[PDB]
Design a protein around this ligand. Sequence first.
Ligand SMILES: Nc1ncnc2c1ncn2[C@@H]1O[C@H](COP(=O)(O)OP(=O)(O)OP(=O)(O)O)[C@@H](O)[C@H]1O
Ligand SMILES: Nc1ncnc2c1ncn2[C@@H]1O[C@H](COP(=O)(O)OP(=O)(O)OP(=O)(O)O)[C@@H](O)[C@H]1O
Ligand SMILES: [K+]
Ligand SMILES: [K+]
Ligand SMILES: [Mg+2]
Ligand SMILES: [Mg+2]
Lengths: 617, 625
Amino acid sequence: TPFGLDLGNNNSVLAVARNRGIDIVVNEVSNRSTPSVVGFGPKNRYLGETGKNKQTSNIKNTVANLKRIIGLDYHHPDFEQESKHFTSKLVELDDKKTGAEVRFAGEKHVFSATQLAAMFIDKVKDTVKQDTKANITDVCIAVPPWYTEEQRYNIADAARIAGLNPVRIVNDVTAAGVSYGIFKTDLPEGEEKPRIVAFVDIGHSSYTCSIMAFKKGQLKVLGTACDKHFGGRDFDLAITEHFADEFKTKYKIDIRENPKAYNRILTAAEKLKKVLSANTNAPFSVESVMNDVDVSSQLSREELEELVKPLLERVTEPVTKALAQAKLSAEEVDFVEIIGGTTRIPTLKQSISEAFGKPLSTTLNQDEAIAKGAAFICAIHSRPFKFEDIHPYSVSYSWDKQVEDEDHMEVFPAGSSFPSTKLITLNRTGDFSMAASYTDITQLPPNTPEQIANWEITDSVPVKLKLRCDPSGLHTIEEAYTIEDKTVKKDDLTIVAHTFGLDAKKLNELIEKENEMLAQDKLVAETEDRKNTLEEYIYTLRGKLEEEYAPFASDAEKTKLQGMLNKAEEWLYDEGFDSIKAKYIAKYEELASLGNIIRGRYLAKEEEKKQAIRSKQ
Amino acid sequence: TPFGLDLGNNNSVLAVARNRGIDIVVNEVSNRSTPSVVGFGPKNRYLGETGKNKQTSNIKNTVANLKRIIGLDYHHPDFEQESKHFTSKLVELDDKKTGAEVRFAGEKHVFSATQLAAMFIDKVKDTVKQDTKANITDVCIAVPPWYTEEQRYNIADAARIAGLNPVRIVNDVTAAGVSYGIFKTDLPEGEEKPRIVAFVDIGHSSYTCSIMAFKKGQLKVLGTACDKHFGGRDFDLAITEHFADEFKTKYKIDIRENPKAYNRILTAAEKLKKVLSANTNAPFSVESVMNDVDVSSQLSREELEELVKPLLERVTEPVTKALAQAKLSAEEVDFVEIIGGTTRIPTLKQSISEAFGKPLSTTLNQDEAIAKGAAFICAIHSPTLRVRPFKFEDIHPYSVSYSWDKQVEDEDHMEVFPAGSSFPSTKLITLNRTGDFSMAASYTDITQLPPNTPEQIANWEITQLPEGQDSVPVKLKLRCDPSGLHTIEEAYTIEDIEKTVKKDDLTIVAHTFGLDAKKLNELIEKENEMLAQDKLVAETEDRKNTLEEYIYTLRGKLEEEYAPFASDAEKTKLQGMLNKAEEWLYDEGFDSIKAKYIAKYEELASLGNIIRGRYLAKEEEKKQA
Ligand SMILES: Nc1ncnc2c1ncn2[C@@H]1O[C@H](COP(=O)(O)OP(=O)(O)OP(=O)(O)O)[C@@H](O)[C@H]1O
Ligand SMILES: Nc1ncnc2c1ncn2[C@@H]1O[C@H](COP(=O)(O)OP(=O)(O)OP(=O)(O)O)[C@@H](O)[C@H]1O
Ligand SMILES: [K+]
Ligand SMILES: [K+]
Ligand SMILES: [Mg+2]
Ligand SMILES: [Mg+2]
């Protein structure tokens, strides 16, 4: 079953392609999104919903912002902008990336961002399995367009650790554009000019604007621009920093000194923010914030807009930047579509409508567009719809000079489209190395390494190579063979690839490690359920003996069972407090063996009553 | 429907007589008992289970120990023993009794003990009505045997405020004895020696021992003794005081300075106590007790037994005193039966088994016997259901005298119901009268009563024609009623004109601990106002939730099942109205009236039901084609 995943900073949305079309998959408490949280306990992990519920009580061992630390160099210049949203300890790894340090299973543990992502992916995979009752094998994962090539490899490997095959890592707004494309049945055709649609997605952490050209059965991305430091969490954080100051004066409590107090305010601040999307004033009240002090305040929409004024100075930058890339003026855009939870804020809606000079459209589902798009894309593997995403930076390939007059060439230019295949023929005097790099490093984000990937391969013998920018926008070499003199195939050379993607050895180590953790989670939950089943059976069976089952057992049988029930409870206090699954099942069955005999006699007179009613009619 | 109420200090149990038996009524979360708690909030009362849940949150406005403050003089010498279990403010009332001061509906309110008890009774009455779908009009309430005559009147009037006729106020252990009596099928008959059974009930606050004689269809109480300051709450308190001291040293937090912190430990201390009924060692762990400090300790059974040592010095006293009243040695009792939650404590079982010289029996259900006995007693009264009869006499421990105006009579004074007699009891007396006269009932020997007991129980005025012969003889019917209350039932002149011919029925004005019609009706009306406000708030919230949930599910269905059954135009008109409804809920629908939540829903459904109809029409074709 094809599986689409919108992995959000705040919540993830799951979609599957089945029957006619594409359904959202609900979680175990029937929610249409799952909090993107990973928590750790003394016995097991708290993944998703239960992770989020324990976020204040388990504060130091709860990891969120999972997609943000993926591929994050510990000395990235934006480290602290990411760091301030963490509640657990972040640490430097051997590879110079970022992990989390947690108390888990009575011990200190360090997990990498790739592992932590896999834990959550595995959780949502299990959620789709419990819903579909099917084997889940392939995933399409939607990511923000600002995701680096490295980050795209990392998240893909996280999928593989979760035991899933990542068929494509798609850009999120592009996945949503697909959902718009497969939905609309009035699109321009043939000679007609395309429909120009602008998409604005503002979520918990990211703000993206993407401009796309639409014809019937196809789309082309013309321009994409992102502000990765623009989203809901920045509004929540401004509110709580404001109240931190006010409560210090008002209540003589400093919530910055108590991580739990701070998180109680942060959590309430999100709710107050939403009230202000609808109302111009909102009260603010939280019980037992710190030292059992109840706080009471308020905030106006005007005051809120002032708190984020430095952030709001960049509100039109993504639209301006996207238009410029698209070579378009704001007049030339036909429709403007908004998605993401944060586009619900009035000041933001005012600004982007004013920037395009056009009213905002809500054709797409705010929360489900991206996930359903990815589920369609995943299904594409096995309604034809073509789409090409934009390739921002020019990428060159290089090789050993040798007998060839040149050693490098621009292969995929800036403003190009992906996926893209470019066929190259090279004269060779022996085995050779290759490498893909960015043509103009100045056009890339600060601190990007120039080299993308490299390869080893195997008067002059010609070789045809297939260079590809794949559907995920990653830079590969697909095949390598020799020519013989129109043309003939001679020999295939083995390619050894070195990319950001993990080697099989490391990948298998991390797969076996996630299997161990998952089996532990399963074992703990099933053990707890058998314990709970026994406890409830003791409780109800005692109550039935004092009622319905009373006429249906001798004094000798009742005292036997009653003593067994008392002994069962006694056991649950002692060796049954933290026992194994088989023992809870065994104690249950020995009670039920006698409990079912009585129920069998009960149900015998129950039939007799029904017969007595019928014989009187 | 006969209703029996076991009103516990910690929890209450409800029983009804129906079908061919007596059943326990479960509450709104399917629990077989209800927390005996009354809390107050900005819009409504939190009664029972919801009162208990908000107990730490709403600590200053949560009233428990309801049955302990009934009839409680603010200057009672045991006042502090009672008040240390209170989390809300206790105040003195105009009548010298005790009430509670709370914040309720945005204001400061003082409620009397009788009012507070009526709030709770009214809650459990609603619970019975929702289980039976009938109207409930009568109750039998089980009370501890140490309840004074005044307290019995107060709780009866609390039942009246709650709209119930209290048919009997029964001693709780007597009610459990009836349960035993109607359950056993092998009791002695005719001339055979009666079976002597001792009953021991230790609950949350009280410890009662009662010795009874049983024959088929009857019981007689032979002796009763109580310790009203001996119960589970005294174990919980000892544990939490122990930890209060420990945590000052270990964690540098003082839970006695923070009532919420204290209650967090008190609540966990009860769970630890129960662990120690089964195990000899127990770990103690509470998260965020105070200032977000987690605490982690342990306690042994031996350490617990040491903490309650001063309490355990008194552990054989109720059995010793009941046996002495019964005039029996311990070996003359045939069976010892235990009930009440706290009889689960190993040290207590050992001690009471040693005092009798007998293993303990658990014939009766530990938690349900009293409530069931009370429902049966309520059912013997009511002239609708006929059951197999069971007679019971309870013990009347104090001597009660009646007095009257001297007039032509030699004495003005007479013992009527002696110490160690039985109730109910009726005595006929003849009095020669020279005019309308006053009477009074009082305790014959006050030194035999609890300290500070007023000597007078009740008094009467009688308003009687001399019949021209200096002095007319009047016959009076004096009664100790089935609840143990002392009244004058009947008063009338007799004449020899025929010899046994009655002359005139006389008017009796009675002054009891019972409330007068005027005051009762005032409190009834108050309870009706509060109860109507509770129903309105609950209904309004339900209609709001129904609207909210409908917005949620209808939006989803337009994406999943209703897509083919609505046009582009139907979808966006409904989508918009859903949006407007959500906005309204943030603004004018935030705290609106019930009719507006209903109107908003109906507006959405008038559109939504059109679409559901079409979906439902095709769903039927599929179950065929
Ligand atoms: N009515 C509302 N008013 C204001 N903010 C809202 C509203 N509804 C949702 N939000 C905000 O939207 C954010 C969640 O939106 P969304 O699910 O689009 O983000 P995400 O996909 O988890 O994050 P990202 O895409 O940035 O990784 C939260 O910060 C939430 O508070
Ligand atoms: N296994 C146990 N071990 C120790 N104590 C227990 C156990 N089970 C229940 N209890 C205690 O028994 C008390 C409740 O008993 P019960 O229901 O008989 O009291 P009650 O009727 O509310 O109080 P009272 O009769 O004093 O007014 C509580 O203190 C509870 O903690
Ligand atoms: K999301
Ligand atoms: K009880
Ligand atoms: Mg998003
Ligand atoms: Mg009791």
